[PDB]
Amino acid sequence: MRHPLQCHWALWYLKADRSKDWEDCLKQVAVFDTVEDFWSLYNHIQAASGLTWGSDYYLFKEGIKPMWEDENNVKGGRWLVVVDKQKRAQLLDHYWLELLMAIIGEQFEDNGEYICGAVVNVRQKGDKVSLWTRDSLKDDVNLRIGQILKAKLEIPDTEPIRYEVHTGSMVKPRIVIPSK
Amino acid sequence: RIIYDRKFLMECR
Numbered sequence: 314m315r316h317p318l319q320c321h322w323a324l325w326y327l328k329a330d331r332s333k334d335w336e337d338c339l340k341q342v343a344v345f346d347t348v349e350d351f352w353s354l355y356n357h358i359q360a361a362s363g364l365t366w367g368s369d370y371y372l373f374k375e376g377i378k379p380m381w382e383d384e385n386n387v388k389g390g391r392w393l394v395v396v397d398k399q400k401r402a403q404l405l406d407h408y409w410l411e412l413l414m415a416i417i418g419e420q421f422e423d424n425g426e427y428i429c430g431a432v433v434n435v436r437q438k439g440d441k442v443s444l445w446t447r448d449s450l451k452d453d454v455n456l457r458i459g460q461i462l463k464a465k466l467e468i469p470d471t472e473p474i475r476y477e478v479h480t481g482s483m484v485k486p487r488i489v490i491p492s493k
Numbered sequence: 494r495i496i497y498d499r500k501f502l503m504e505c506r
């Protein structure tokens with residue numbers, strides 16, 4: 314018996330392609346719903362850090378396309394956490410794995426229903442790791458998630474994580490930890 | 494609702 318996950322998650326992958334547009338690079342790798350199956354994917358895919366520039370992995374509930382326009386996201390936000398370009402080597406893969414284990418293992422308490430997914434952006438300037446939420450206004454639910462994200466990933470108080478919505482002005486973040 | 498911690502998940506590897 315494999316151990317059933319509360320729900321079905323989908324791994325997505327996107328490699329940057331200059332000529333082609335965005336949505337067509339968005340490739341659904343597999344859909345799993347047991348711990349054993351998650352590992353089978355994870356053990357055998359390319360480590361996040363190993364990835365080329367402009368590439369992502371998304372892990373989202375099934376039937377949620379990992380984009381803004383999607384209905385599950387249209388009214389949501391995310392918990393952005395930047396990885397320093399130079400301390401990237403020893404942090405990135407921990408942060409991403411620790412998150413995926415946090416989400417599939419349902420660690421955000423009575424708040425799980427608001428988790429949409431998790432994204433890793435491999436980039437030159439900085440690598441990014443975010444947790445997408447369903448509704449960018451439930452600041453209790455968002456704050457609580459962020460506290461847990463900070464715990465799970467052991468992000469210190471000197472590297473602040475921020476929640477922000479999904480122009481006119483530069484839009485400032487809705488929540489920050491530690492606060493200012 | 495099914496809850497698995499990181500300790501457990503790693504024993505599944």
Ligand SMILES: C[n+]1cn([C@@H]2O[C@H](COP(=O)(O)OP(=O)(O)O)[C@@H](O)[C@H]2O)c2nc(N)[nH]c(=O)c21
Nearest residue numbers: 335336367368369379380381382383434436441
């Ligand atoms: C997550 N996302 C990214 N893009 C495209 O990806 C690019 C932005 O890239 P990014 O992956 O948000 O990070 P970057 O700002 O460091 O490049 C733009 O060209 C967008 O058109 C997106 N385009 C749409 N329509 N919807 C999305 O959810 C979406």
